[PDB]
Design a protein around this ligand. Structure first.
Ligand SMILES: C=C[C@H]1CN2CC[C@H]1C[C@H]2[C@H](O)c1ccnc2ccc(OC)cc12
Ligand SMILES: C=C[C@H]1CN2CC[C@H]1C[C@H]2[C@H](O)c1ccnc2ccc(OC)cc12
Ligand SMILES: C=C[C@H]1CN2CC[C@H]1C[C@H]2[C@H](O)c1ccnc2ccc(OC)cc12
Ligand SMILES: C=C[C@H]1CN2CC[C@H]1C[C@H]2[C@H](O)c1ccnc2ccc(OC)cc12
Ligand SMILES: C=C[C@H]1CN2CC[C@H]1C[C@H]2[C@H](O)c1ccnc2ccc(OC)cc12
Ligand SMILES: C=C[C@H]1CN2CC[C@H]1C[C@H]2[C@H](O)c1ccnc2ccc(OC)cc12
Lengths: 173, 173, 173, 173, 173, 173
């Protein structure tokens, strides 16, 4: 069943790209404009927001998508160069895709967790002692995070199935 | 009369996609900017808005459109792969489309109801006791909700007619 | 003279589509941010704006354009399906186009009238008794309304001429 | 010298379209946001701005461009319809283009004049007695107005030269 | 060495167009929003900004680019008209391009100078006596100005080299 | 191994272009709007921001990308001109690309360093003595800076490998 696997993998990849490109930028538009802290100190909002969200989810997902698509670009460009052999590059391409997908999934888990809390406790200079800050659209961001995790997991499973179908002797050489 | 059914189904799908893509993003632009609560507590606006609208309508409809279109993409990609049999995949594609459409319609009803009230009563921390908040463009959003429900219902009816035409005997095999 | 009629109909349809798509969105961009009421009550602006303009003109016109273009799309897709008879679908398409155009024109008149006043008197909760609110760019919106009415009337007249050319005898059968 | 006339006319038309489409919308973006009146009365800004600028320049120019291009569209669509005679439609097209261009130029002069003053004196309700309001980017708007007038005048002269070349004898028949 | 000249000229023209189109509009986005004067008089900001920057740099550069490209458009359209002689049009086009480039460079120098100061002294009505105003991103605008001047100078030198290569006897005839 | 080098070089170039074009403009959107200084002096924010960030990172990277791509454009245009010899232009193109890449990398290091601090001490007129200002999203900008440096270094290494492969003897002649 190596064919249905490829069909599903292509469909899932396209689905993820479309969803991100269409909704992600709009969801995270006012992330910093609607972030508010209970204080009068100038500059506390900037510091607390930067501590709460070092990297936005949307940029991480864009980077992940491009990086995961890169090996296919390598293979296609190699094929173009060859004309005006290819049965070996394919195995290495598959292995690299598997490694990249797994690494990105693990990194997402270790960076963001599984939910976006509605409150944040911040104690960065210049804020005096510890202050409380309030996040914008926590529930939508939680839903987006869980959905992206599920899609990435499906992709990982399909890639592992493909790699197993090839056989580890192909991967060895 | 299986041909007029397909014609109407295609026309309705295109109509829904066009309407959403052209007007939806503009209707819901200032959903959070124009949401106001009668209070002085910092952070009450964020909490009350997040409780009132956990997920925006437009994002739900975009997700629904992509998911409903997915099975046709699966079928087209399978057909492409086959060349450089297909009479069985079509039945499963139809069944999956029917199930997805019905599920999305039911989910929309259970999530949003049939109207958007102009007032909201919010009792989420940090708001003190219970406060009153006011929504932006409730009437336009109600009209949009009802129109989308009607279009989805028409799609469901056409899909059921198609599935009935194919037949239960054929579906079983 | 059934040819010049078709030429003019196509030209006016394209003209209307272009004008709307190019200027309408920009005209109605700040409709709600520049709407102000003389009061101190929170939430009175939202209620009064929603009562004054239940549906924006631009969205009504977009819906009208798509709906009016739908029958031609149905005819085209039926023609595509036929290859890989058509002289009867054409009459029904013409009749449906006539009905839709007339209905949309009448609806526009009954919804918006012929002018956009510069003042509004609002007595919706939470506003206390009666308040006075001030509209943004009333004159430009009045000009746009009248222009759209005139274009739609021209389209209706051309469609009626076409339908008369076809003849009642043919329409009946 | 009927050929260089056509070459110059085409080049000028393209030049005008490009200039408008590229810069006009950006010039007039903050026309109402940066318009300020010296008063405390709510709603005086809206009334005074609407009285000072009933129709924005950019929208008038867009309408003019589309209307002037319409007759060529009529001719092209007629030519397409003819295949799957034309030496007479051309003369009427030229005459209509001349009339439209002259009318639009005269209308622009009678609507806007030749300059945009930096101050405005406004006595519209609800403003008390007479107030003073201040315009945004008067000099750039004056330059744009004069440039558009010059380009339209060049177009009118070229069209008149073409019409004279065709001849009154031919035009009458 | 008439070929490398043409190659470099084409490359430089494309480079200038790309740089402007990509960064210019973003650099000058908040030119008026971030312009502030030290006063309490309503309307002083508008007058002082209009006096300081009668025409934005970006619009001047867009106009220059279109005007400089115009003669090539004239030549191409003439060539198209000729088919369904040309060795004399080309020299006239070269001369016109040289004149336009030199004129635009001189005009830029006389209009803007070589730097954008960070302070402005403004004494325009309604400002009382003389006030001080502060500009936004003076350094980036200075860098952009110098870069555009250098690119235009390179273009002028290449055009002069081409014209000299053609020879004076040939331009006279 | 001169083919895999070219494959990797093309892939990394495309990757860098995509990442910049997609995320850079959004990261640096509110650079000046969210920059705040602890003072009451009008005009201190503008001066301090201009001193802290003379040129935005995104514009520098756009300029670098276009300049690095220029030599390939020159070579392609020369090839087009040649038809309707080339083995010597290629070496000079490679050398120029190497020089440009190295220069841009060194310039980036000397201009921006390796991190974006969260605080800035500013003593520019009109600010009184020293003031403290707070930056927006320092961590994301630091990550972007480091990532761009790494990608540029990889490109430099690949270019040096290519140049070494061609040979010093060949480069001399
Ligand atoms: C369909 C979405 C629209 C929004 N952005 C501008 C117009 C349209 C294209 C998209 C962007 O160019 C873009 C192009 C390609 N890939 C993208 C991937 C992600 C993205 O934002 C997360 C924007 C992307
Ligand atoms: C026609 C609408 C315009 C508004 N958005 C940017 C330019 C144009 C395209 C559209 C967006 O890229 C987009 C592309 C494709 N499908 C879409 C589907 C939905 C949507 O918003 C709900 C935006 C979509
Ligand atoms: C020409 C207008 C521009 C403004 N909008 C984005 C870029 C360009 C396209 C248009 C929009 O995508 C769009 C596409 C197609 N039909 C439309 C119809 C109506 C509309 O606004 C009323 C926007 C439309
Ligand atoms: C080149 C200009 C850009 C700005 N607008 C969106 C993207 C690009 C296209 C243009 C608009 O779609 C548009 C299309 C066609 N004709 C137009 C004519 C005028 C215009 O504004 C006055 C905008 C136009
Ligand atoms: C690549 C730049 C993007 C920004 N603007 C909208 C989308 C893209 C196109 C460009 C504009 O339509 C445009 C088109 C063509 N020539 C232009 C020249 C100059 C310009 O701004 C100075 C904008 C231009
Ligand atoms: C894919 C990104 C989207 C955002 N901008 C508008 C729509 C889409 C295109 C891009 C811009 O036109 C653009 C075109 C080409 N090269 C670019 C390079 C850089 C850039 O910003 C740093 C914007 C670029």
């Amino acid at each position: 069943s190596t064919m249905i696997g490829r069909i599903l993998l292509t469909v899932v990849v396209i689905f993820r790209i479309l969803i991100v490109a269409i909704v992600g930028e709009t969801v995270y538009d006012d992330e910093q404009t609607m972030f508010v802290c209970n204080t009068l100190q100038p500059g506390c909002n900037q510091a607390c927001y930067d501590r709460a969200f070092p990297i936005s989810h949307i940029r991480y997902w864009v980077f992940q998508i491009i990086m995961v698509c890169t090996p296919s670009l390598c293979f296609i460009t190699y094929s173009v160069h060859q004309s005006a052999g290819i049965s070996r590059f394919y195995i290495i391409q598959v292995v690299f895709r598997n490694a990249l997908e797994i690494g990105f999934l693990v990194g997402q888990y270790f960076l963001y967790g599984f939910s976006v809390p509605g409150l944040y406790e911040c104690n960065r200079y210049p804020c005096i002692k510890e202050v409380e800050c309030y996040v914008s659209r926590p529930t939508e961001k939680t839903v987006f995070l869980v959905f992206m995790f599920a899609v990435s997991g499906i992709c990982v499973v399909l890639n592992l199935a493909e790699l197993n179908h090839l056989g580890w002797r192909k991967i060895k050489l």
